[PDB]
Amino acid sequence: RVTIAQGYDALSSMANIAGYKAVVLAANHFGRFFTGQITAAGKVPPAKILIVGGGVAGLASAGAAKSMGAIVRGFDTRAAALEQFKSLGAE
Amino acid sequence: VKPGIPYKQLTVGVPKEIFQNEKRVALSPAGVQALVKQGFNVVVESGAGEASKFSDDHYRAAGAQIQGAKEVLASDLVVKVRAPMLNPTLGIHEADLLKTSGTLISFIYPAQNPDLLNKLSKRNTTVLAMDQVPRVTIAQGYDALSSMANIAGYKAVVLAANHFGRFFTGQITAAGKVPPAKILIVGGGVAGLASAGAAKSMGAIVRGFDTRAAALEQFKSLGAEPLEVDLKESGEGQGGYAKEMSKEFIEAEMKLFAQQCKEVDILISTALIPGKKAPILFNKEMIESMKEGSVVVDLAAEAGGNFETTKPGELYVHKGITHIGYTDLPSRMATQASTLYSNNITKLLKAISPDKDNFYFEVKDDFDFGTMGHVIRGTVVMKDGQVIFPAPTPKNIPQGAPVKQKTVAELEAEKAATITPFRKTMTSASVYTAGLTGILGLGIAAPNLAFSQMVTTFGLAGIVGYHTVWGVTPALHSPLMSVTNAISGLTAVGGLVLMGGHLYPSTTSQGLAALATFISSVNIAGGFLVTQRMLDMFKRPTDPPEYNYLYLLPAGTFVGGYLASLYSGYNIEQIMYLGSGLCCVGALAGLSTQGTARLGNALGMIGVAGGLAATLGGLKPCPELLAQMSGAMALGGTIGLTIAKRIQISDLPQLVAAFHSLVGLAAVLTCIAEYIIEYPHFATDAAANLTKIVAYLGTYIGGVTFSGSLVAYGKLQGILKSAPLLLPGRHLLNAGLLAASVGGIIPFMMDPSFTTGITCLGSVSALSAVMGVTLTAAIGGADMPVVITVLNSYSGWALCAEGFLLNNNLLTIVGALIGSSGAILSYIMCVAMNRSLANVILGGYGTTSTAGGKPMEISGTHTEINLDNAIDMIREANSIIITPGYGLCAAKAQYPIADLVKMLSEQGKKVRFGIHPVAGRMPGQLNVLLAEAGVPYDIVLEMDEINHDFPDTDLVLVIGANDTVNSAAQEDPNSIIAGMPVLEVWKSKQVIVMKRSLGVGYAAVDNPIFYKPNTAMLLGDAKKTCDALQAKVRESYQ
Amino acid sequence: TVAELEAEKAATITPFRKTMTSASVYTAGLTGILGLGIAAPNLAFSQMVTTFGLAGIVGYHTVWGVTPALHSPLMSVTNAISGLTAVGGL
């Protein structure tokens, strides 16, 4: 994993696809909305998703869950991945 | 005896659904808290919520009472999801197990099930069909089909992916670019809009199409691409629903769909026409031309289908294209469906019987279109055994036929088309010939050279004062007014020149210009202390230390440079006047970027000291007259310093109204005293007709400035009454006073006696005082800041009066600096509301954008919360905007608010303030009151800077504001505040309004943001509610 | 980056020296005004210095207001109005 060899990194590609597929498999088995609307029929709260460990799959899951409507409160032990979480918009 | 059966002996039952693959429940555990607080007993079957993840413990802890299955159907009000069907686990129809003469709440579909109505008519029961609820304005709360369509539209998008092979989003990865997925949506209803929203949030490209012209507008508002066909046929039928299309239109639409079926990846068809089956829109060869791997979702599989290849209940892969044709999409999300359906049932049972305990539920036949009788008649299918299902016709239907409502900004854009560019250029060219002919008129009437020089320096100083007042920060408009009242205390310069004698005045003309010097030295000390006490409240405690005493170095070089140049035998007064005027300009120019504000007070002090020193050095008095002048200025300054530091800042407008009257008297004292001292010189003079005219006009202007301000003081303190005192005449009286004042200049000329001149000066002073009293008392206590600023202009121009009168060059520059300041402030404040100056003074109705009668009436009910919901909803939010009004500072409630912001900023939120320009009793009052409470100025934003940040805002606290957060300014062209620029607080997630009761402040009889679904009321006094919130935030975070 | 090297120049100027050089600029301007006052032979010179200072401030504010797309028509307009040296020739 170096700078000039990031155009051909198969593990990062499969981690990105696994993160997006974990998000889109979280919904269709979770029986409520992620977004939450204020209609004139009742307040529905957004879903709350926690992501242990932000690498490639963790940040892919944070992006796919944040753009869909939920709020993310992920965590990682490294000090750079928390700044990547804050840049993606998580807690 | 009240008509009805009380809620105590009236129980409800929640049966488990028996239909195949049905997972929903009629009442959630959150939905059996209501219907227990209302009064019903609740009996729930033992396993009714296990499929939708609602445990039995939540039921028996929320207030229900768990029983079996045969005795829950024999309840007084059975509430279930689907129709009562044949029970297979013990052979009996569920209509046989119902209680005799009971009431049922479920989906029925009575036009397709007559035999079930024949079963229910024998048990003498009452039927409320949830699908027969008429779609009117007062019934958004109980609309079950819209909720099921919303859930199906979300589930179709989230079920299209997890079967589609690749991404919806599309991104530029370092491995390579991937394009987004293209999604077609056929039919914009509720499921169509939900599908478009849930597909656009995931980053796809949506290109939906619908026949009705409103649905394409909702497509282009959701961010989609509205398609089009080349045939113009009206898609609408009888109302909001669609109708059957012609065969040629269907063939052209299928041509469009066969054209764009070879490019999309997902397609969702939601087309459903009421009255008959769904239209076939896709052939079996039209759909096989797609890519290998496409997903095709059909949300009309129950009522036919939009495809001739759809098995109506299963998935199958037909030559590489998956067909999702599920008939129960809300049953796959049974938790959200159960919660929304329980909310609809709760709001229905609340709306049909609003009494505390009667449950009367009357069915009528004659009803207005939109009243509760319409809902109760259309919803009830069976009333006490008989079928009354075909509902009668309503009254005169309002019908919403102007769908495109004429919004307020549409009407000014339509008014701008009457302004054809020949008339624009003609009214542009007429203003300039008016101005140049006025300049020629000033040139003809000029007696000498000094008048022409004074007109030139007046025009140049007026342009300088125009540009330097638009440059100030809008957060500093009240230090602007205080420092202009400080600089307008240079009417002492006019008092010193007409001042002579010894220790005491000799003549009455010399005695008037000692009272003038006295009451004009009050303004200087008062304005400079109150400006100094306001500008050091804007100093943040983390700011670097400021050593302002170094500005004693220019002053001692300037004033001390005059005296050393006066001891050496020179005459520097006409250049000291320039230096003093430039320092007064730089006092306002420094009040423009918040870091040079303390510079722009010291420069004004240097200018005032240099002007006074140059006047005293030019006069060269005897040492006994200098003692009189120093005693007068010292006593006036002592009074100014001792009334400028004992007041509170919230009492600042009254003091400002006390500063103009001391100017307005002083001008009247200096014009009259110059008519007396210059009287034996008029015979041997050519400028005698000049210095009389100005001495008339200044005597008018100060006469309006004095008495009007004394009304403006008295209506702010509470001495006078806040209601506009209207007289019978009110226009003939004021027009006669003005005609008498401008026609009394004719006996003042053509008659050179002293007896007839002093009576004309006294007459114009008396008529101007009566005119100020009459014009100011008809305004009302709300529009009173305009009177503070317009008169702030007059005390400017009064200075210019004596600047032309004493041939003094400092007074014209200072007066042109102050009159433009007051004029620009009155303009800003008469633009911040959509009114005009004659609308404010003469008392018109409403504003300039108000049309004729009948403003719109409100719609919906208001939510009310307590302190605990408010603190639980403050805790959840991340970015908070507070919009304060004058109600915050009238209750002295900004001190808990500043500490609340200080606590919530440390926890990691983003708390800001949004200030409207006409909140408060003065321009920029609320900024200085928030600075006094301790708020740093970098989180206090104006209206124009924060009004686009309301969609990205989680919570808005509206505190003491009614009209500046009103939405009727942008929607209703008949309203009282139409076209007014307002804070758009309703465009956020949630708004908490804190006020005493549901009333009005000044106008706008009901505020329609209070009845929106995202606004909660927090009724109570603002002081106790704000410091109770402070106490909760303190005791919960420590 | 270059703004990060400009930050240590913007943060090494003490709050005393900013106020000291500002008060120095204003005291130099005021003593220059006094110096123009002493050298005045008559009243027409004082009136002309007054209209000169006011017209200078008007010209300062009015040419920051022009659109940056019209700076060369501004140049052309000032060259057209500077042909009023014919007034001095007539």
Ligand SMILES: NC(=O)c1ccc[n+]([C@@H]2O[C@H](COP(=O)([O-])OP(=O)(O)OC[C@H]3O[C@@H](n4cnc5c(N)ncnc54)[C@H](OP(=O)(O)O)[C@@H]3O)[C@@H](O)[C@H]2O)c1
């Ligand atoms: N500022 C200026 O320069 C200027 C100039 C010209 C005109 N005006 C006028 O000033 C008005 C200002 O409007 P605004 O939006 O600031 O307020 P507003 O429309 O005047 O009404 C104040 C609101 O605060 C509430 N309130 C009052 N005292 C309260 C207290 N102690 N605790 C809690 N709530 C309290 C009132 O309702 P409850 O009594 O029901 O609680 C009312 O809803 C403008 O509409 C305009 O007419 C101002």
Ligand SMILES: NC(=O)c1ccc[n+]([C@@H]2O[C@H](COP(=O)([O-])OP(=O)(O)OC[C@H]3O[C@@H](n4cnc5c(N)ncnc54)[C@H](O)[C@@H]3O)[C@@H](O)[C@H]2O)c1
């Ligand atoms: N162009 C580049 O700079 C580039 C490209 C590709 C990869 N990378 C690097 O390679 C890594 C990519 O991550 P990946 O997903 O491929 O690797 P991975 O599969 O090992 O990620 C596992 C994640 O879990 C985290 N983790 C480990 N133990 C944990 C614990 N006890 N609690 C919580 N979290 C824990 C790790 O920090 C890591 O983020 C990163 O370090 C990234 O900087 C960089």
Ligand SMILES: NC(=O)c1ccc[n+]([C@@H]2O[C@H](COP(=O)([O-])OP(=O)(O)OC[C@H]3O[C@@H](n4cnc5c(N)ncnc54)[C@H](O)[C@@H]3O)[C@@H](O)[C@H]2O)c1
């Ligand atoms: N304020 C109000 O009065 C108000 C507010 C909201 C909703 N409503 C009502 O609710 C309805 C919501 O729609 P719905 O989802 O309940 O209806 P629905 O279930 O019938 O939706 C089917 C959609 O397909 C469209 N369609 C029909 N034939 C078509 C064809 N041949 N080609 C393409 N599209 C076709 C219809 O116009 C409709 O938009 C509105 O139409 C309106 O009547 C009223």
Ligand SMILES: CCCCCCCCCCCC
């Ligand atoms: C006598 C002719 C002039 C009348 C007006 C006196 C000066 C007022 C200010 C002029 C410019 C607006």
Ligand SMILES: CCCCCCCCCCCC
């Ligand atoms: C820089 C502005 C002019 C400075 C003038 C200094 C004093 C000159 C005196 C000339 C003889 C009266």
